[model samples]
Target: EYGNDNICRVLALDGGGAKGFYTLGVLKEIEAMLGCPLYKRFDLVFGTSTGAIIAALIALGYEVDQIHALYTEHVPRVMSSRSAAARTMALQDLAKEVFQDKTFEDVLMGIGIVATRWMTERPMIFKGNVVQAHGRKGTFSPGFGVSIADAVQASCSAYPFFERKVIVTAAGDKVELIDGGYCANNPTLFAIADATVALKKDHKDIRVINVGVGIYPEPWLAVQLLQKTLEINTQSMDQLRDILFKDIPTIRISDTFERPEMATDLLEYNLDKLNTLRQRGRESFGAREAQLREFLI
Candidate 1:
């Protein structure tokens, strides 16, 4: 199925989440059935996510396309800096102070202090010129957003010689950022690619490809699976009384938008959809999980 006229049959290993284990099992089963290896010589392996991680490990053992393999997010990397250690220590101290008390104000103050300290020592992390363009706040994700603009500019500054390609797989209702602030409902991938071209002067060979939108309700099913499989026992009032509320202090960070609450909303949305699917007599949980795995792949 994965062969073309120009190329021989290619072995595809789906690497999304637990697919790596499944693929390996399938391969072993096939090998056992055949009574020998599928090929006498060599084979090409293409994968994503966990599969990408596996591919990277293989590549490290036998160097091939090092740059491409290293580009994968899961490839482990180390940070060695005294400043980083100091910043971590400072953050930990602030966390400890806030944890001792159960007040939101203290938590917010602690976060602000940490942010200020981090910005002072590592200003370059937020030094991209395009930081003001995206209207994003704080340093990390927003800083990366600024860097993406900078990367586009650097790649296409000397245009005609360097062809630029942006592959935006799944962004919704945001095309102006990619299409020179013009057009709507443009494919997400194309928008990202176009944005890259717009930031630079020379790149005329810029191409944008949109792969459309995808939706999967896996998290809800995950919660359901956990609830169904795991045994839970509630404590009696007497037992609960033995645990003092003062001993269990909860600190709320005001500055950091309650991400856990947002996540809960997302899971709830998925769970509602899963329930609907279940009512329809469809493979609700497993189907969505498979789709999610495929996307990751």
Candidate 2:
């Protein structure tokens, strides 16, 4: 399962046990077929459950300093006696399949080889959703999912400046301001205004700034004006474009969900972690309070 040292060192690694091996093989094949290594190019890797645990242990073992990310979803912190035995048996079966006639020691070595191969390829990033551990039910659990989310959020927060702006207007209104200095009437603006009014009911202190009609309803221009009004000066329009258009990938909202079977467990783990972190007075890593304030103002 391992790649050559040179290749492994450049690409991101994802570790797993038996299932991990299966997944790794699939990832490697996919990479080869694509004629490019996704792990190396993206500097990201994600794992769930057992695979995530293996990745965390491997990262710690390697003393990976660059904040190598790990994600664990639906794992038990501790395994029950029966579950542990079952896992061991599963490993034994996997070993037999991989090592054929080799000794158990050799099978273990083979597993290591697979893991090493993954590690040598690249830096790793792991992502996972929280979930309960199977078998041991509530007894055993792993928190890699929480760890990965935190790490990624922290990594993104390293950048000091972040901003978002939104403008609403009516349809058929000339976005550009004419001599009258009134924003050209747009039907869409009415909808936006109505929505804002409703929102302000709950947030009475919220002020809705009118960028004043006729500013040319270009989405880009609207965003720029909002930013400028809030004193968010950037390097250039290109940089702003990069932030707004290029760097952030498109996400399908409908596709955003966890597996149904794991939803309850995942939410429980997430809320628990949230409460714990809140009690510790740790702010959310990537909430970008400063940026959000600027937007609001």
Candidate 3:
């Protein structure tokens, strides 16, 4: 009833810390366009860091506005702390409040939250039951009794700003982890891999909606370091867009405002900058609406 059963719809969300507010804004526009909750529109969802937080919420059938409200109410507290230690504690408390008692097993769709192994520097996936069997041998693992909040906490615990997470595997092994932004920050490649390799979907039948924070380009000192780091996270996605334009029906959305510098702050709540980012998301999506309708509708 939704459409072709042969196609796999993949939604890939990028990490942007507090810039995630902008992502939620784009999602709000998308839900409006589709006239349904996001979970009803996609087959599988992949996210890292803050994106992982949104992915878990969508899996539970949350409205984009609902997620937005959570951010509005909690972010000031999460990002306003004086010490990294205090911020980390606030972040953990927020995650707990977001997921409550929900476990990975509780989510209704195919979902994966990406995080990096601090010890090995390899990417790890915390997958939901729908995508569990298709995980590549040795690469995929279950929640191993972890709650959604804990998985998201681990997925987003970026270095220095927050403490690394420790998780016990189903095999009874203890592992240390960091933010997936260090590795699969864009996460679109992992979504494609999961769709084709793990889910065994046909390349021609795959569809993607890949969203990201604004690009930091053509320009930084310490800001330069920030730009470089952000670029590293999203660089492959540009190449992937060039390479896979035809094989998969895809729509990639991001901020292309005149001044990206204003949007670079990770913690501080810049009201004007954030509002601009949100508006940019809606405008970007609207510009791509024709193509989106071709596949999404």
Candidate 4:
């Protein structure tokens, strides 16, 4: 996969705090194994839900420790609310509370947050970028209404299990938003491919690394049990997430995991799992760092 002339590495990240650590752990392992800037190969990044928040933080040059600090200090507050307004406000506040007054355009690299509007219609990939990513009256009105914080909130809020957030675009439209997982549980692949295509590149060159998606025994048990299901083809969505790329290389974090029975949904937080953050991150991805050294660098 080495071509000095024209090669692009698109980083697609996933959500869920458990999986987010997998991404961070993988990055740290890359640095340790290669002992160099091996992760610099990634030209751009696209993420969803928790992945979205981390994407912005990374683009803003936040290190692993920084991310950990933010998560440890702010998540409890972010998830404390069950109301739409409160949830939206909490996510929006994280930008200032965590980053401290930096404009989205100030970041050094290209990153995007892929989120959905209302889980009521087709899966809409709302972007959160500096130039053209704004919230507009609760829909995909591009980027001209709300702040980047609002975009993150609309992109992350999960329904039913988590609080539903309603955002009002400058256009005077009020819309309810929730986790993109309701539609694109595995948004990394889609977000990267789409971004590459937009940059006038071949989408087939997409390279993906998915972490901590260990097929929880009854991951969908709760979603399916709900009277109002968010996905059109719930099973199909699950299948798409576990896809096998024909040409583009795909790397799934080699992991064997079991859910804590009640941890059936994405927003569960799974405090039990959070307690094992460091060990699980290593277990989920760092353990395989050596084998992936050459392939990555």
Candidate 5:
């Protein structure tokens, strides 16, 4: 499913709280739809906010089945007891323990996490850039030295909701990170093919195909009322959607608006609908997989 150094398949996810679970749902659909081993379809993955969190879980080998349990049984039990401040640290600590079996190096996917930079004009990680297997000379390792968990924490640190984490490097630099969607929610069209050429010796003039999965909730205060309100806010999602579908070959989850499985919000959403949403992920992608089969190569 992956391609040569130049040819890369980039998978991107949105940051809609618990809504990100839909990603696995779509992955499940694409897997069954394509009728092939699915993981091989992606060479690199880019995710921000909740998307970042889920991608990290996948890297650590969390199956979609285990995810709901992680949040339902383990996550609540671990988080509810902590004080607000304690919860901050506890959250990261809990993630480490849950995923101790693996490190960034052990992950099957080469992933890029998106977050905003608060302290500097630019962050150690860049926009439209994939995480290098190793850090650049004189820089901390993005993969080896840091745990995949840390990257997830940094990428998922949204302002106002999630805490802002400052990462201290061995070089004595402090960098405060925020959400990646602020920079670019969908990175498939970022000309990663050229970026790969500059950073890696893997391929030449390769074709780059980006697939983005959007996970926005249906609506609140009844679907119609909330739909009108939410539509005003999705300029970002809409903009990306137009580019992906019009400019390139792409698939987006938002194509379906009222599917019953449109559950979202990771930190504060209903846990009961987890299974329904996962199955919905499978349902929404119906026959749509045919459009992507040729590109899955």
Candidate 6:
């Protein structure tokens, strides 16, 4: 339906560690809602942190359920309670094994994996199929040179929890990278920017589905202070979206205050909590089922 010259469909995924299961759950429900493969529905897909992993797998043609199974089978080992170094090692080993030797050229659609460049401390998007940013200093190509696995690891390499991913650029320059969550945890604006500038699509012609981790609760104490400062960028994405594209048909599916318990640690993998998150995803979708159905139609 959106095969016209101006209109473009964009999918933006937010970063939230184990909470990525929530995104998977939402995608599964949306797939069923629309009765088609979720990956095939988008003209462009961009993700950050764990969302980056999901985006790559989707572009590589893995089903949502397959990704869920893959996460269940491997995430524990990667998040095991060991030294940070050991956990990081496990993650890289797993990332390499599953996404081995695959580059952006093999991706099925336009994709962007957002990661923070350590040297510049700014978010940089690794591009695939999407038009590369011309004269932009913070973007690079994964298709011609870098491996997809490296990009995923770099995007998920959140500050102190894991070590920075050091990747060699096409020009043989070494770049240290970290999680894009530090800056563009939601990446909605990045996708919009890419569409308007690189793809030459207007805001009116773009449709975006921004799946957030959840609605963060208000901080009650000093313990929540650090959490507030670190995670508030996620909210900025939502704020900017509303301000810039008030007339656009965009939907942000995220669990609200209805499930405060769903907000758990990024590393928390308790079965009950995760299941609750997944269920919350379905419930959240149901809350806006009418609007989503209309948008899809």
RMSD of 2: 26.4
Report how far off residue 20 is in candidate 5 (Å): 1.9
Q: Rate the local accuracy (lDDT) of all candidates.
A: 0.24, 0.24, 0.76, 0.58, 0.55, 0.77
lDDT (Cα, tens digit) per residue for candidate 3, span 96-156: 7767787866677888888889778798787766445553456444576677777888887
lDDT of 3: 0.76
In model 4, the runs with Cα more than 4 Å from the true position are 1-5, 17-19, 34-39, 77-89, 123-145, 161-176, 202-206, 213-223, 227-244, 259-273
Ranking by TM-score: 6, 3, 4, 5, 1, 2
Worst 10-residue lDDT window, candidate 6: 135-144
TM-score of 6: 0.89
Model 5 lDDT per residue over 21-140, tens place = 556667655555445343455556666666666666655465556665665565444335434455567668866877664555666666667666886645334322244534354443
- For each candidate in turn, the TM-score is 0.20, 0.20, 0.88, 0.72, 0.70, 0.89
Tell me, by TM-score, which candidate is best: 6
Colliding pairs, model 4: 134-143, 136-169, 137-169, 157-178, 157-179
Two-way lDDT contest, 3 vs 4, winner: 3
**Top model number, lDDT:** 6
Candidate 3: where is the Cα deviation over 4 Å?
1-4, 130-141, 216-233, 244-246, 260-263
Which pairs clash in model 6? none
Candidate 6's residue-wise lDDT over 233-293, tens digit each? 6677668878987877778877666455545667875667777777767777777877876
lDDT of 4: 0.58
Better of 1 and 3 by lDDT: 3
